[PDB]
Design an enzyme around this catalytic site. Structure first.
Site, PDB file in Angstrom:
ATOM      1  N   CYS A 150       5.282   0.516  -6.511  1.00  0.00           N
ATOM      2  CA  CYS A 150       4.027   0.381  -5.710  1.00  0.00           C
ATOM      3  C   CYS A 150       4.164   0.227  -4.229  1.00  0.00           C
ATOM      4  O   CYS A 150       4.559  -0.828  -3.817  1.00  0.00           O
ATOM      5  CB  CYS A 150       2.897  -0.427  -6.336  1.00  0.00           C
ATOM      6  SG  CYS A 150       1.382  -0.367  -5.258  1.00  0.00           S
ATOM      7  N   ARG A 161       1.408  -2.575  -2.158  1.00  0.00           N
ATOM      8  CA  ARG A 161       1.448  -4.136  -2.462  1.00  0.00           C
ATOM      9  C   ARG A 161       1.048  -4.905  -1.191  1.00  0.00           C
ATOM     10  O   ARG A 161       0.993  -6.343  -1.631  1.00  0.00           O
ATOM     11  CB  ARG A 161       2.716  -4.531  -3.207  1.00  0.00           C
ATOM     12  CG  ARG A 161       3.067  -3.875  -4.497  1.00  0.00           C
ATOM     13  CD  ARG A 161       4.191  -4.590  -5.197  1.00  0.00           C
ATOM     14  NE  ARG A 161       5.313  -3.446  -4.811  1.00  0.00           N
ATOM     15  CZ  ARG A 161       6.691  -3.673  -4.823  1.00  0.00           C
ATOM     16  NH1 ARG A 161       6.799  -4.919  -5.488  1.00  0.00           N
ATOM     17  NH2 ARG A 161       7.590  -2.958  -4.555  1.00  0.00           N
TER      18      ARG A 161
END
Ligand code: HEM
Ligand code: HEM
Ligand code: M48
Ligand code: M48
Ligand code: H4B
Ligand code: H4B
Ligand code: ZN
EC number: 1.14.13.39
Lengths: 403, 405
Positions: A107, A110
């Site tokens: 991801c 974040r």
């Protein structure tokens, strides 16, 4: 031995000591690296994962070794020893869900991990109730285009029973209709879920952008079908700031990326239905969803309209079309007042996140092949950044399709 | 299914299993605990004999004479040679096989479809820096071939017990100077500041341009390196222009035709060739994206974007993406106009996919480093992005080695 991690643009070096906290194996060995593969190939165990998680929690609120810390460990111990399982407090679930996002190596978003709205739906006992919770999540997260990150957590897996599951891979997905001659109308990624929906009594459309119903499953029951109310599903028609014909393509995308097929693991407990949502990075839509050859595959259409030389790769027709498509996505979301981030802004924020986490935890697990965007890779700072990939818990994991 | 890595292509839905990785004899940097796949440079009589036997077995397998009397007699000869001297020497045909195999084995090379077509110049008789220079000049002439580039490697004598190494100090045969300015910036190529300063230290009179070709610093065994200036007519360069943006030519940009890497170690059957420069032709993103647009290289993105009148004050205009595409187009157009071989990243990756299919059939897999194979612009527009890859070390191999200084 702890890895030395170099940034080649800046010449700076850090050391990742956080990976020492990893308790779960990835796919690599000294003989061969499997880093580019998309998917993976008892009471004492549960107790040690639980203790570790409780320790993380009390450390997080600056209460390690307190009265409260010690009594909570005793509670978890007593419940596991008697019942083979245990239950989280709501505040622990909240902390656990944010930590699973913080820990997600794939991801790029974040920097936002601390800002997550957590909906406790562990008191859900039917597919009908699941639908109500899902509608409230979408309503909250969408917020008329001012998107807000959220997760809704349904009841954990239990040794006795079937799981709670959302069959759809995202809460909003376009149908993919397979033709008697193999080809696909709509999104080819969704052929199988589309067929399952029809099989469970949904009347299909025949468009390129038909929003699918949800197939929601309570334990040991056939899934039930729920059509999302149209007013809950915000969509953005795509246009281009200078190319007038772009709008004529009839392209659109939905506002809310809401992933609904991943398992949330906290303290050894497993939440098989825990849909979460943020906001899009423009390349997910503009590059992957629209230009993947196995997705909407629009690159040739656009290149032809731009009057590019399609007969040879060395005209860079693909590259030129892809840029204009990504520009259309950004322009269209900005015009519609819907939250979106471009890949430059996102990767710059991720570099700030890496710095924050180095100071906070001594490292940050990150999967280079997923963090670097699918266009203009080396034009972003993350390309030049070495990264160490490893699995920390709490975690989001893949799980088998329920059918 | 099979207990070998399962490898998926996500565009096609197709599956292969890599069985070739079973032949890896050397560990990479990853462990079950953590993947270090994205790091650029992650950290003997009986030993030599087993590496040699393995390589001799590969050679005899490749000529289909495995288990034969000629195969055993070669094994005995190598054992004897090692026994009495501590080292051994390759036959001419073994060196050719080994050099091609090292290229074939290189996981970071997207150009491996060409692996079978490599001209191997045997320079194992070289005994002076002056002679290395002659061999290097000949290599350049052969490989450049007036713009119709040909892949070549020149192999100088192997590392030997006691004696010092043959080394080329330069990282490539053609490199532009990088001159540290008083203000702290760099004129020319910042990648080459250290080699530039060494050339000056060893007596080169520096220029002050952005594209000054560096001299070669060549080292014969147990001697100080010597400086050699490449005759300019040997170094083919391509001035950059753009097919529609007429002002692009006024930027005064250029790049050299021949990518000739000179600081890698060629390892064959435990023997180490510390000087073995090799060359192919460029893929256009190496010049147009990396060398010209990296922030730590020529860093020209903003200059080009300003000339294109783009909005450089906001990320969401995609000015970087638009400028990079045009720079890459200029590289391709310019090499094409100059009749100098170049390959675009779409063509290169398509050919690499064909290479993967060939190697799956020939050897049961192909070691490949995804982060290096996927081009630095337009990654997912190319078929390699969607292909899972398995990375591992096979020998013969090209390896990194420490700088001679
Ligand atoms: C706030 C806005 C966010 C942005 C811009 C963002 C960005 C991204 C992107 C671009 C990817 C790769 C997606 C792909 O290629 O399919 C990704 C992966 C992921 N993100 Fe986020 N993210 C956001 C919020 C979240 C939230 C709220 C969660 C969970 C609470 C989350 C967890 C994940 C996970 C688990 C993955 C990996 C999924 C997989 O392996 O398939 N992210 N993120
Ligand atoms: C025929 C045309 C060729 C093309 C288009 C080509 C393409 C490439 C490219 C684009 C890279 C990545 C370079 C970088 O990012 O710095 C590369 C790496 C490499 N190629 Fe090639 N290649 C070719 C020929 C060769 C030859 C002739 C050899 C040796 C005999 C070779 C061995 C390598 C090696 C060892 C690397 C890895 C370098 C490293 O790890 O730093 N290639 N190739
Ligand atoms: N913008 C965001 C925010 C959060 C996200 C969270 C997760 C994801 C992953 C989307 N999943 C598709 C990738 C995938 C993975 C595994 C198998 C597949 F077929 C496809 C994308 C996100 N995008
Ligand atoms: N077109 C080609 C052909 C063959 C090649 C062979 C090798 C290379 C590698 C170029 N240099 C490696 C980059 C690097 C690696 C490690 C440390 C550094 F400072 C720089 C590029 C090639 N390009
Ligand atoms: C094979 C390869 O791992 C696969 O295509 C990956 C590459 N990187 C990716 N990166 C992101 N962000 N999302 C993806 O789906 C993928 N796909
Ligand atoms: C940190 C990262 O590994 C590094 O920037 C790599 C990424 N991929 C690359 N790929 C190629 N072909 N060449 C490179 O120099 C790099 N650099
Ligand atoms: Zn790995």
């Amino acid at each position: 031995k702890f890895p030395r991690v170099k940034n080649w643009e800046l010449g700076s070096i850090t050391y990742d000591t956080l990976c020492a906290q990893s308790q779960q194996d990835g796919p690599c060995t000294p003989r061969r690296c499997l880093g580019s593969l998309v998917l993976p190939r008892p009471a004492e165990q549960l107790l040690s994962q639980a203790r570790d998680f409780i320790n993380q929690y009390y450390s997080s609120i600056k209460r390690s070794g307190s009265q409260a810390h010690e009594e909570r460990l005793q509670e978890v111990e007593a419940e596991v020893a008697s019942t083979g399982t245990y239950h989280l407090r709501e505040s622990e679930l909240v902390f656990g869900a944010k930590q699973a996002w913080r820990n997600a190596p794939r991801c790029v978003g974040r920097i936002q991990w601390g800002k997550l709205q957590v909906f406790d739906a562990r008191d859900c006992s039917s597919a009908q109730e699941m639908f109500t919770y899902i509608c409230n999540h979408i309503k909250y997260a969408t917020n008329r285009g001012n998107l807000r990150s959220a997760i809704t957590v349904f009841p954990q897996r239990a040794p006795g029973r079937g799981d709670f599951r959302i069959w759809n891979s995202q809460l909003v997905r376009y149908a993919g209709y397979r033709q008697q001659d193999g080809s696909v109308r709509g999104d080819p990624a969704n052929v199988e879920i589309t067929e399952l929906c029809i099989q469970h009594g949904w009347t299909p459309g025949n468009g390129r952008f038909d929003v699918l119903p949800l197939l929601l499953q309570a334990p040991d029951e056939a899934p039930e079908l729920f059509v999302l109310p149209p007013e809950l599903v915000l969509e953005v028609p795509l246009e281009h700031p200078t190319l007038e014909w772009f709008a004529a393509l009839g392209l659109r995308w939905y506002a809310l990326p809401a992933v609904s097929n991943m398992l949330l693991e906290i303290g050894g407990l497993e939440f098989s239905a825990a849909p979460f949502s943020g906001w899009y990075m423009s390349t997910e839509i503009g590059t992957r969803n629209l230009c993947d050859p196995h997705r909407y595959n629009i690159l040739e259409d656009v290149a032809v309209c731009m009057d590019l030389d399609t007969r040879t790769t060395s005209s860079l027709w693909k590259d030129k079309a892809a840029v204009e498509i990504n520009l259309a996505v950004l322009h269209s979301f900005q015009l519609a007042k819907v939250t979106i981030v471009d890949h430059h802004a996102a990767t710059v924020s991720f570099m700030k996140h890496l710095d924050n986490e180095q100071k906070a935890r001594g490292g940050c697990p990150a999967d280079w092949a997923w963090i670097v965007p699918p266009i203009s890779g080396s034009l972003t700072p993350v390309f030049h950044q070495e990264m160490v990939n490893y699995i920390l818990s709490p975690a989001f994991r893949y799980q088998p399709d329920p059918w």
